[PDB]
């Protein structure tokens, strides 16, 4: 069986435009453990995406943290695109500053 990934996209610190920060894409609750994670800036892959080690939780589902350095701007959009076999299409979640 397959478990569909749950995604949160969010910043390490409260966002200030012009202030350097870390952008996380926290992916959880998936099986099988093989997964593809991309962080995007204005629809283009950020090259410097650091990926934490995978782990699993007490319900056996796997999780992982993807993160990158970024500087929030009034005009730049950020997202996280996830590819997994539970999903017929990749799932894209946009960074929302209120979430």
């Amino acid at each position: 069986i397959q478990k569909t990934p749950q995604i949160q996209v969010y910043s390490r610190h409260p966002p200030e435009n012009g202030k350097p920060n870390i952008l996380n894409c926290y992916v959880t609750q998936f099986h099988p453990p093989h997964i593809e994670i991309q962080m995007l800036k204005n629809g283009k892959k950020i090259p410097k995406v650091e990926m934490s080690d995978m782990s699993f939780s007490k319900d056996w589902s796997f999780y992982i943290l993807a993160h990158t350095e970024f500087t929030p701007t009034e005009t730049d959009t950020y997202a996280c695109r996830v590819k997994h076999d539970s999903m017929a299409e990749p799932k894209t979640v946009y960074w929302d500053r209120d979430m």
């Binding site: 390490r12 996380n24 943290l65 993160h67």
Partner: peptide, 15 residues
């Protein structure tokens, strides 16, 4: 209620 998430510096966030 969202899943508790790691800030990445040893701390957590939730809302």
């Amino acid at each position: 209620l969202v899943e508790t998430r790691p800030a990445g510096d040893g701390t957590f966030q939730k809302w």
